[PDB]
Amino acid sequence: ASILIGCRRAEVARTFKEIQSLIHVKTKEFGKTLNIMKNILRGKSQNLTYIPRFCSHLGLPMQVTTSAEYTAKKCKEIKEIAGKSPITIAVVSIYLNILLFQIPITAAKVGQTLQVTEGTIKSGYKILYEHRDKLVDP
Amino acid sequence: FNMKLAINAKTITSGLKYALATGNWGSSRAGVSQVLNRYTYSS
Amino acid sequence: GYYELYRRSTIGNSLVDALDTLISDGRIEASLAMRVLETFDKVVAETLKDNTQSKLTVKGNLDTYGFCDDVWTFIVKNCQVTVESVISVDKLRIVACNSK
Amino acid sequence: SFNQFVDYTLQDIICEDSTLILEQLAQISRKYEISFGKIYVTKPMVNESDGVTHALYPQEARLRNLTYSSGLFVDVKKRTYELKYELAEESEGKVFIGRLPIMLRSKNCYLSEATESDLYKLKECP
Amino acid sequence: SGIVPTLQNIVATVTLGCRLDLKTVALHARNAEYNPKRFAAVIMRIREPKTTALIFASGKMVVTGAKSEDDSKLASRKYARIIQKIGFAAKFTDFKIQNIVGSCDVKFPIRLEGLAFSHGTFSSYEPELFPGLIYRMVKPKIVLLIFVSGKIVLTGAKQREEIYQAFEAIYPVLSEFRKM
Amino acid sequence: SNAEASRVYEIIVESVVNEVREDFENAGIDEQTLQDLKNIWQKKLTENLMLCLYDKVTRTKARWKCSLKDGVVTINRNDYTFQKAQVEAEWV
Amino acid sequence: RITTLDETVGVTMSHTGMSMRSDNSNFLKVMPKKEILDYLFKLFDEYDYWSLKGLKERTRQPEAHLKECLDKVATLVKKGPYAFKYTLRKEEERKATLGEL
């Protein structure tokens, strides 16, 4: 918990899954502890960052990354499923942006590598494809 | 058991980085590392 | 080991009736009758385990259900039963004992 | 001298003592064992705070108060015994032990292969 | 506005006043389940009002699944009668509603991140862990689950007015954070 | 109507009799008494009850599903024997 | 020789740090009281040493309940090869007394 906090407060981002890879917290128990800690901090008184980090894992060009950033902001405004957690949106946003460009990752490789269910990426892709009209930076 | 916890990278990494920063091999040796002299290309 | 539920089956009742007769009608050693039934319990179990192929499908209204002491009791009404043919039954009683 | 150390010494040091076994007792006794294989060296890289990772050319390396280094990977094969009976998980791992500083112009650094105008793009005076 | 929350589940407790033999209870009831190894209570059910009861050896009983307070007391009395009919010296006492759940639809999408930022001390929102925002209201002390779709869940109430009170209090806030 | 049933029934009678013979001989009763048991049992043999084992029982709302195994049923005066059975029933 | 990995270097680092990928390999993943007590006592004459585990396996009761009654009949030895096992100190009369109570 304290780690994930310091990540947040540091403007860095780490996924619940990632920390979950460093430590086995059982999940739900973790959420409750994190919330109580958050409450204590208030008493003592943002997906976007994830997008470049993922490119790293894929080693994608800069233009791809910034394209993905525009894509994330545009997708969040257009609403429609509200995101179903940010992680799915960040990965799908990428998958779109890359498929725009010629650079193959195909699908299963990104689903494995980034640990997103292939069905999830394709499902996100259909709805995202529908709004292809307004997501185009130039 | 999880590999990331078992292997600690800063042991080696920060170890070497430290040593070359201080230049002390241990003291058992000291001053082995020295900042380069750019006074003149000869120097 | 071996549940005694199969004694309530057509083949089980028949056995009971036969033995009861040998005991009463004759002078055939009772207690041995029990020994026989103990054998029955085991045989029906292995036979139904190793000598069956059929797969049944029962679909209908659940009139009543119940659980106590590792036994599930169901009473299905207006159901269609499929063998591997389609049969219909107004009222079917099911009694099931834990496989584990 | 540094190049010889990179090509040969890392492989030999890891190879000489790699094997370590755990002795497990039960009442049946048991072993666990981990070996170190062919080591792997990278090209020089940088980990930024956010976690974006990218190649490092020395110029920038100076300006940003960085350390010019490449990562090191090791092949870890893990085994389990039960007692010489052998089960275990293998292949599939390539493990990051730590970073190794890299001497400029050596075979590992990016500049050693550069040409004149090439160097000029990177702004390292030939 | 015009929207009033719909009650979805009422949980109540009843003291029967006498010890019970659970195998006996499970055996004699028409709609009972009892596996000591899984949970220490007979799970009994009745068709009208459609509810489920958790019956303990101490004679205490939890009744859940009702959609109205009337239905809760009704079904509770019914379960007590069943226990009596089976033969125990049970009494219908201490009927008390412990939890009321309600829900409604405001008919517009909500900006959860904005709401969480604005009402930070009462809010908890981790969309990767659970998609809804958990809002912990002070007065009345009710917990609300707020979703992007505009569907709202209110829980933790002991009285119906608290469900109604909380929604009235939250509506202006949901409006302030609408999407269209 | 089922043939597998009659076959199973036959296996049961034959199998039980031969096993029971030891005890029968021990009790010094009579081989022909054993034969009588066999003939009477088979004679008797010539109400919609299923006896079996359960692997799993589940429920979601008022929908119940059951994975039954190794059983015997009498449906409308006919007998069936099965390896597996699936029950899909809706409670109210 | 030693082989230099030539990749975009991003993939290698992603695998290094927290990758959102876990597991994929495994290494060191690591009768009523009357008849119950009477039966357990017959075991005590049958075994001068036994365990709450052996008793709980027999009686299918929590070890805590088994530990209470055993304190009355049996005593514990915590030292030696038989350590953490209860040793004893008519059996039919005790069984009939258990049946009465």
mmCIF file of N, CA and C in Angstrom, chain D residues 24-89:
data_model
loop_
_atom_site.group_PDB
_atom_site.id
_atom_site.type_symbol
_atom_site.label_atom_id
_atom_site.label_comp_id
_atom_site.label_asym_id
_atom_site.label_seq_id
_atom_site.Cartn_x
_atom_site.Cartn_y
_atom_site.Cartn_z
ATOM 1 N N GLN D 24 17.026 -30.555 1.328
ATOM 2 C CA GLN D 24 15.776 -30.568 2.074
ATOM 3 C C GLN D 24 15.569 -31.935 2.713
ATOM 4 N N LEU D 25 15.199 -31.938 3.997
ATOM 5 C CA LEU D 25 15.000 -33.157 4.765
ATOM 6 C C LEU D 25 13.529 -33.313 5.113
ATOM 7 N N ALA D 26 13.035 -34.551 5.050
ATOM 8 C CA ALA D 26 11.635 -34.813 5.361
ATOM 9 C C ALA D 26 11.466 -36.218 5.927
ATOM 10 N N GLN D 27 10.563 -36.325 6.902
ATOM 11 C CA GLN D 27 10.143 -37.597 7.490
ATOM 12 C C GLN D 27 8.842 -37.423 8.260
ATOM 13 N N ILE D 28 10.751 -37.747 3.124
ATOM 14 C CA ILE D 28 11.881 -38.117 2.280
ATOM 15 C C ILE D 28 12.714 -36.890 1.943
ATOM 16 N N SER D 29 14.033 -37.031 2.026
ATOM 17 C CA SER D 29 14.926 -35.904 1.808
ATOM 18 C C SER D 29 14.859 -35.439 0.354
ATOM 19 N N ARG D 30 15.319 -34.211 0.128
ATOM 20 C CA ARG D 30 15.014 -33.489 -1.095
ATOM 21 C C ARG D 30 16.124 -32.487 -1.413
ATOM 22 N N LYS D 31 16.280 -32.168 -2.702
ATOM 23 C CA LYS D 31 17.184 -31.102 -3.111
ATOM 24 C C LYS D 31 16.453 -30.101 -3.990
ATOM 25 N N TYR D 32 16.927 -28.860 -3.923
ATOM 26 C CA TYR D 32 16.621 -27.772 -4.846
ATOM 27 C C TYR D 32 17.913 -27.233 -5.434
ATOM 28 N N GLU D 33 17.933 -26.939 -6.729
ATOM 29 C CA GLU D 33 19.194 -26.496 -7.299
ATOM 30 C C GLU D 33 18.986 -25.445 -8.376
ATOM 31 N N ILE D 34 19.896 -24.467 -8.386
ATOM 32 C CA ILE D 34 19.873 -23.338 -9.302
ATOM 33 C C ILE D 34 21.248 -23.204 -9.932
ATOM 34 N N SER D 35 21.283 -23.138 -11.255
ATOM 35 C CA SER D 35 22.531 -23.027 -11.994
ATOM 36 C C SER D 35 22.498 -21.757 -12.828
ATOM 37 N N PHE D 36 23.680 -21.258 -13.169
ATOM 38 C CA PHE D 36 23.803 -20.060 -13.977
ATOM 39 C C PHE D 36 24.451 -20.425 -15.304
ATOM 40 N N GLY D 37 23.848 -19.964 -16.396
ATOM 41 C CA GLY D 37 24.256 -20.344 -17.717
ATOM 42 C C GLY D 37 25.025 -19.263 -18.439
ATOM 43 N N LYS D 38 24.885 -19.261 -19.759
ATOM 44 C CA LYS D 38 25.459 -18.226 -20.602
ATOM 45 C C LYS D 38 24.927 -16.866 -20.193
ATOM 46 N N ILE D 39 25.829 -15.966 -19.834
ATOM 47 C CA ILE D 39 25.451 -14.616 -19.435
ATOM 48 C C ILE D 39 25.229 -13.766 -20.677
ATOM 49 N N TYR D 40 24.370 -12.763 -20.561
ATOM 50 C CA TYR D 40 24.053 -11.897 -21.680
ATOM 51 C C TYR D 40 24.278 -10.445 -21.314
ATOM 52 N N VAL D 41 24.917 -9.707 -22.209
ATOM 53 C CA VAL D 41 25.175 -8.300 -21.981
ATOM 54 C C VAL D 41 24.356 -7.542 -23.008
ATOM 55 N N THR D 42 23.953 -6.340 -22.652
ATOM 56 C CA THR D 42 23.162 -5.500 -23.525
ATOM 57 C C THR D 42 24.021 -4.398 -24.118
ATOM 58 N N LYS D 43 23.385 -3.566 -24.848
ATOM 59 C CA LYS D 43 23.952 -2.293 -25.222
ATOM 60 C C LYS D 43 23.659 -1.293 -24.113
ATOM 61 N N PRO D 44 24.352 -0.167 -24.070
ATOM 62 C CA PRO D 44 24.122 0.792 -22.986
ATOM 63 C C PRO D 44 22.700 1.333 -23.003
ATOM 64 N N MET D 45 22.056 1.345 -21.835
ATOM 65 C CA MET D 45 20.696 1.840 -21.746
ATOM 66 C C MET D 45 20.501 2.704 -20.511
ATOM 67 N N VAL D 46 19.347 3.370 -20.463
ATOM 68 C CA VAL D 46 18.927 4.206 -19.346
ATOM 69 C C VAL D 46 17.500 3.880 -18.939
ATOM 70 N N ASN D 47 17.262 3.829 -17.628
ATOM 71 C CA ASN D 47 15.928 3.756 -17.046
ATOM 72 C C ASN D 47 15.503 5.124 -16.534
ATOM 73 N N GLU D 48 14.555 5.764 -17.214
ATOM 74 C CA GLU D 48 14.028 6.996 -16.647
ATOM 75 C C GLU D 48 13.077 6.707 -15.491
ATOM 76 N N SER D 49 12.835 7.748 -14.689
ATOM 77 C CA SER D 49 12.019 7.623 -13.483
ATOM 78 C C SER D 49 10.668 7.004 -13.785
ATOM 79 N N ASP D 50 9.943 7.575 -14.744
ATOM 80 C CA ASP D 50 8.649 7.033 -15.128
ATOM 81 C C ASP D 50 8.724 5.568 -15.540
ATOM 82 N N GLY D 51 9.883 5.099 -15.963
ATOM 83 C CA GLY D 51 10.044 3.729 -16.391
ATOM 84 C C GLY D 51 10.275 3.568 -17.872
ATOM 85 N N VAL D 52 10.156 4.636 -18.655
ATOM 86 C CA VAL D 52 10.556 4.543 -20.047
ATOM 87 C C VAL D 52 12.041 4.241 -20.114
ATOM 88 N N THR D 53 12.407 3.322 -20.998
ATOM 89 C CA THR D 53 13.783 2.864 -21.131
ATOM 90 C C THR D 53 14.237 3.060 -22.565
ATOM 91 N N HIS D 54 15.437 3.595 -22.736
ATOM 92 C CA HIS D 54 15.897 3.919 -24.074
ATOM 93 C C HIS D 54 17.413 3.947 -24.076
ATOM 94 N N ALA D 55 17.974 3.856 -25.274
ATOM 95 C CA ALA D 55 19.418 3.828 -25.418
ATOM 96 C C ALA D 55 20.013 5.140 -24.932
ATOM 97 N N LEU D 56 21.303 5.107 -24.617
ATOM 98 C CA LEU D 56 21.976 6.235 -23.990
ATOM 99 C C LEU D 56 23.206 6.621 -24.792
ATOM 100 N N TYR D 57 23.174 7.797 -25.421
ATOM 101 C CA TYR D 57 24.474 8.100 -26.006
ATOM 102 C C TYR D 57 25.287 9.009 -25.089
ATOM 103 N N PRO D 58 26.598 8.777 -25.031
ATOM 104 C CA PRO D 58 27.416 9.394 -23.979
ATOM 105 C C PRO D 58 27.223 10.882 -23.783
ATOM 106 N N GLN D 59 27.013 11.661 -24.836
ATOM 107 C CA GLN D 59 26.862 13.101 -24.654
ATOM 108 C C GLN D 59 25.809 13.364 -23.592
ATOM 109 N N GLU D 60 24.580 13.004 -23.946
ATOM 110 C CA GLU D 60 23.471 13.122 -23.019
ATOM 111 C C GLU D 60 23.820 12.506 -21.674
ATOM 112 N N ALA D 61 24.507 11.366 -21.691
ATOM 113 C CA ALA D 61 24.897 10.720 -20.443
ATOM 114 C C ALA D 61 25.623 11.685 -19.523
ATOM 115 N N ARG D 62 26.595 12.417 -20.061
ATOM 116 C CA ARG D 62 27.251 13.465 -19.291
ATOM 117 C C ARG D 62 26.244 14.493 -18.815
ATOM 118 N N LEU D 63 25.498 15.083 -19.748
ATOM 119 C CA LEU D 63 24.681 16.231 -19.373
ATOM 120 C C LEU D 63 23.717 15.894 -18.248
ATOM 121 N N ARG D 64 23.148 14.702 -18.256
ATOM 122 C CA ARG D 64 22.073 14.384 -17.333
ATOM 123 C C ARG D 64 22.546 13.795 -16.015
ATOM 124 N N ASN D 65 23.844 13.777 -15.743
ATOM 125 C CA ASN D 65 24.366 13.199 -14.504
ATOM 126 C C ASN D 65 24.015 11.719 -14.410
ATOM 127 N N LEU D 66 24.280 10.988 -15.478
ATOM 128 C CA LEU D 66 23.922 9.590 -15.550
ATOM 129 C C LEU D 66 25.155 8.728 -15.374
ATOM 130 N N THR D 67 24.935 7.425 -15.362
ATOM 131 C CA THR D 67 26.001 6.444 -15.414
ATOM 132 C C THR D 67 25.869 5.674 -16.708
ATOM 133 N N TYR D 68 26.956 5.555 -17.441
ATOM 134 C CA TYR D 68 26.905 4.929 -18.747
ATOM 135 C C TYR D 68 27.120 3.446 -18.524
ATOM 136 N N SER D 69 26.081 2.649 -18.751
ATOM 137 C CA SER D 69 26.156 1.240 -18.408
ATOM 138 C C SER D 69 25.194 0.471 -19.290
ATOM 139 N N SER D 70 25.466 -0.816 -19.418
ATOM 140 C CA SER D 70 24.561 -1.755 -20.055
ATOM 141 C C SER D 70 24.078 -2.769 -19.036
ATOM 142 N N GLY D 71 22.902 -3.314 -19.283
ATOM 143 C CA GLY D 71 22.361 -4.300 -18.383
ATOM 144 C C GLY D 71 22.995 -5.655 -18.597
ATOM 145 N N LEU D 72 22.870 -6.505 -17.584
ATOM 146 C CA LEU D 72 23.356 -7.868 -17.650
ATOM 147 C C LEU D 72 22.240 -8.865 -17.423
ATOM 148 N N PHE D 73 22.211 -9.895 -18.250
ATOM 149 C CA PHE D 73 21.238 -10.954 -18.097
ATOM 150 C C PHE D 73 21.942 -12.283 -17.894
ATOM 151 N N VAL D 74 21.268 -13.167 -17.167
ATOM 152 C CA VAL D 74 21.779 -14.489 -16.842
ATOM 153 C C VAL D 74 20.668 -15.485 -17.108
ATOM 154 N N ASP D 75 21.040 -16.660 -17.602
ATOM 155 C CA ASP D 75 20.109 -17.764 -17.783
ATOM 156 C C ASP D 75 20.078 -18.587 -16.513
ATOM 157 N N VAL D 76 18.932 -18.590 -15.845
ATOM 158 C CA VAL D 76 18.764 -19.300 -14.586
ATOM 159 C C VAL D 76 17.945 -20.534 -14.888
ATOM 160 N N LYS D 77 18.511 -21.693 -14.606
ATOM 161 C CA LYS D 77 17.786 -22.945 -14.676
ATOM 162 C C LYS D 77 17.599 -23.450 -13.260
ATOM 163 N N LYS D 78 16.361 -23.733 -12.892
ATOM 164 C CA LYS D 78 16.060 -24.166 -11.544
ATOM 165 C C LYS D 78 15.633 -25.619 -11.565
ATOM 166 N N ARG D 79 16.134 -26.380 -10.606
ATOM 167 C CA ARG D 79 15.884 -27.803 -10.574
ATOM 168 C C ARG D 79 15.533 -28.236 -9.167
ATOM 169 N N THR D 80 14.918 -29.407 -9.078
ATOM 170 C CA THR D 80 14.430 -29.919 -7.812
ATOM 171 C C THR D 80 14.618 -31.425 -7.795
ATOM 172 N N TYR D 81 15.050 -31.942 -6.654
ATOM 173 C CA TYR D 81 15.393 -33.341 -6.511
ATOM 174 C C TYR D 81 14.645 -33.912 -5.322
ATOM 175 N N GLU D 82 14.551 -35.236 -5.280
ATOM 176 C CA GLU D 82 13.685 -35.886 -4.320
ATOM 177 C C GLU D 82 14.201 -37.266 -3.958
ATOM 178 N N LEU D 83 18.398 -39.633 -3.476
ATOM 179 C CA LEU D 83 17.405 -38.607 -3.774
ATOM 180 C C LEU D 83 17.582 -37.988 -5.148
ATOM 181 N N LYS D 84 18.468 -38.562 -5.963
ATOM 182 C CA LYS D 84 18.822 -37.939 -7.233
ATOM 183 C C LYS D 84 17.652 -37.809 -8.195
ATOM 184 N N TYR D 85 16.475 -38.320 -7.851
ATOM 185 C CA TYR D 85 15.324 -38.162 -8.725
ATOM 186 C C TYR D 85 15.160 -36.714 -9.149
ATOM 187 N N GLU D 86 15.010 -36.506 -10.449
ATOM 188 C CA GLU D 86 14.865 -35.178 -11.031
ATOM 189 C C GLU D 86 13.461 -35.018 -11.605
ATOM 190 N N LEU D 87 12.777 -33.952 -11.200
ATOM 191 C CA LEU D 87 11.453 -33.655 -11.728
ATOM 192 C C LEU D 87 11.462 -33.404 -13.228
ATOM 193 N N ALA D 88 10.910 -29.397 -11.827
ATOM 194 C CA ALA D 88 11.899 -28.469 -12.356
ATOM 195 C C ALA D 88 11.309 -27.579 -13.448
ATOM 196 N N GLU D 89 11.899 -26.398 -13.626
ATOM 197 C CA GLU D 89 11.501 -25.460 -14.665
ATOM 198 C C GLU D 89 12.754 -24.879 -15.298
#
